[PDB]
């Protein structure tokens, strides 16, 4: 009798590289370099697309950011034409403030409990339209209650009851004209001082015309602080002051009671697709150890290499005939 | 391969063997047949899966790093940031290239090795009852029906049973 020993072969072999040979055919191989993205920055993740919403706007509530005031997110996507503000102004320490928010997890809001006696608090503007002229959702605009009436020296203290450090934002208003300040807040010296156990500073309006944006020569500037638990922020002002109505609490400081921990905030021009590794080209699978898509990455990512392909043999040498 | 079985004294692979990587083909009084060897097949597959387990699904988390694209000329510090990243990529590109070349050489050698082990094991089983024809085939010097062939494949072949018949056939004129 005859007994022959042998091995299999396939008609469709794959060429791989070895130590001694540039081109050798094996029965099967797998690709080690990820070379494509689906074109979207992300399935299985909780994501929010701010869209028109600027990110900082989530804190103080322009009409844009109406949906996203109390958002809960694992992944947060900023967008390019987004405007943080309805009435022209800018945040102090702006870039630093966003980085806080991106990694927040989202934000929870609770009222600071402020109440007012003799003032207009319902200040509205052409800039925040919203069915009818309006203001920031999360703040109150304070006015004399009778035009040209000198504004009251007032004091507010709010104390951070919660375990998570609170986020507090306030405004200084620089009026369109020296007149408008007068009409709004009365006349004479205007001083605003903000006091916390780690924080104190004093602000004064410097009223003037500035280039007309959103139809307003006037500006509002936002200053923010982080308040440790059990700490009082004291607000003292004779006017020109935009007041926080609500405190912002991060979700990744929650006690596992709202708690949605640790988000990654990205900047993307791509659509979304719910069908771990992010590149500027879009998210990429991370099953492969290497990738050729982008040297810039975030997350659990394959390592960037220059090769476009690297085949790992997963079968024996292919010897047909 | 370094053992010289696959692409060596075994002239070619069998496309018609689709139930295993290694196996037996026989010809006897009852006909011609083919049967896969599961143990050697699984031994090769386990080693390859061991390699895959080291490479697949084990990436490492990175978060905040350095910038790697720049919109303005800055000189010194930007030269340094670019050089650091370029250095890192070349070193990882080297690691990846060598890893694949080394693993592949080894995969081709281990699969050749499993084939050789099966051949050597079979040879020892047959004792003085068969001769190696030099192409991975044994000439068996006795009547060996399907059950006999089967006993060889499953390691229950008793050479003493056939030895007298085999020796007379081998050593004559």
């Amino acid at each position, epitope marked *: 009798a005859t007994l022959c020993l042998g091995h299999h072969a396939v008609p469709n072999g794959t060429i791989v590289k070895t130590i001694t040979n540039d081109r050798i055919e094996v029965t*099967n191989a*797998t690709e080690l370099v990820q070379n494509s993205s689906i074109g979207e920055i992300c399935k*299985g993740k*909780k994501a929010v697309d701010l869209g028109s919403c600027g990110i900082l706007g989530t804190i103080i509530g322009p009409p844009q950011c109406d949906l996203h005031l109390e958002f809960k997110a694992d992944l947060i996507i900023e967008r390019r034409n987004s405007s943080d503000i309805c009435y022209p102004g800018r945040f102090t320490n702006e870039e630093a403030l966003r980085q806080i928010i991106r990694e927040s997890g989202g934000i929870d809001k609770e009222s600071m409990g402020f109440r007012y006696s003799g003032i207009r608090t319902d200040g509205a503007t052409s800039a925040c339209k919203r069915t009818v002229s309006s203001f920031y959702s999360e703040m109150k605009w304070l006015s004399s209650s009778m035009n040209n009436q000198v504004f009251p020296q007032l004091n507010q203290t709010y104390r951070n009851t919660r375990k998570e450090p609170a986020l507090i934002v306030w405004g200084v208003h620089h009026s369109s004209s020296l007149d408008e300040q007068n009409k709004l807040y009365g006349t004479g010296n205007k001083l605003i001082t903000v006091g916390s156990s780690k924080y104190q500073q004093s602000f004064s309006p410097s009223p003037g015309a500035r280039p007309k944006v959103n139809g307003q020569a006037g500006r509002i500037d936002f200053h923010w602080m982080l308040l440790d638990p059990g700490d009082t922020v004291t607000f003292t002002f004779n006017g020109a002051f935009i007041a926080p109505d609500r405190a912002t609490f991060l979700r990744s400081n929650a006690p*596992s*009671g*709202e*708690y*949605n*921990g640790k988000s990654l905030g990205i900047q993307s021009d791509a659509q979304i697709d719910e069908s*771990e590794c992010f590149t500027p080209n879009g998210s990429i699978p991370n*099953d492969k150890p290497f990738q050729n898509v982008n040297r810039i990455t975030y997350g659990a990512c394959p390592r960037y290499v220059k090769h476009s392909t690297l085949k790992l043999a*997963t*079968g024996m040498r292919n010897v047909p005939e | 391969g370094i053992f010289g079985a696959i692409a060596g004294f075994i002239e070619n692979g069998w496309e018609g063997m689709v*139930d*295993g*990587w290694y196996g037996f083909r026989h010809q006897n009084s009852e006909g011609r047949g083919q049967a896969a060897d*599961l*143990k050697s*097949t*699984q031994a090769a*597959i*386990d080693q*390859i*899966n*061991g390699k*895959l*387990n080291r490479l*697949i*699904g*084990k990436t490492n*988390e990175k978060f905040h790093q350095i910038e790697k694209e720049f919109s303005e000329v800055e000189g010194r510090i930007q030269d340094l940031e670019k050089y650091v990243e370029d250095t890192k990529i070349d070193l990882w590109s080297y690691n990846a290239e060598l890893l694949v070349a080394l693993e592949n050489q080894h995969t081709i050698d281990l699969t050749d090795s499993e084939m050789n082990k099966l051949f050597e094991k079979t040879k020892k089983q047959l004792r003085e009852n068969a001769e190696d024809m030099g192409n991975g085939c044994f000439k068996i010097y006795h009547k060996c029906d399907n059950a006999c062939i089967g006993s060889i494949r499953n390691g229950t072949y008793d050479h003493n049973v056939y030895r007298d018949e085999a020796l007379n056939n081998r050593f004559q004129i």
Partner: antibody
Amino acid sequence: EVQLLESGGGLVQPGESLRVSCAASGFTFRDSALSWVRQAPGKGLEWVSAISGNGGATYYADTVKGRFTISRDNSQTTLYLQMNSLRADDTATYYCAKDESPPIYNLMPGYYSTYYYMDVWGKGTTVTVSS
Amino acid sequence: EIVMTQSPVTLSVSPGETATLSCRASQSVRSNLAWYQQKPGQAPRLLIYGASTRATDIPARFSGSGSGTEFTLSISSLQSDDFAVYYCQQYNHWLRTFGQGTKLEIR
């Protein structure tokens, strides 16, 4: 539908033998692996053994390394488990569980991929070992 | 031959809150790790395999993570029917082992 049904079990004296069947019905072509997992009421899960292709497993836990033996009958599509030399602590609800592996592993369809996770569990058969 | 320890033995979480579980494992393990949801009087059901890859047609509120030794399982939006016990297995030592089990409460 990939459900399997466990038959057999019951009350046995310590030291006796008992085999439990597992009718593998449905999507399973039975070129994939299968496993047994036992759990006693009042205790957690514990993997017992596994089977692959033909005789590729040979995979038993250290508790039953010398007692339990796993059979496979692909012609009638039923998985077995001969539990010999049963002791008192062998009283458990033996579950027959499907086995799935990532598609990168399991090169040859029949043989064992040494990384399996159980996806479809069975109804379970309770086996009590006392005097 | 490779013990698995879950923490804690039982946890109380209000419905809606996120419940994070622990699956500490002696010796390294990354490739294979499966989570299960065994409701009382029922067989275990696969939730996540590998480490983070969840099973087919299971809710997205079940999240998985971990590497080598420390592994976590977080249930985003909790429901009253999630009162099951959760387990975690590992590779390989040619001998898979299960976890002790984590009881989840919902007043």
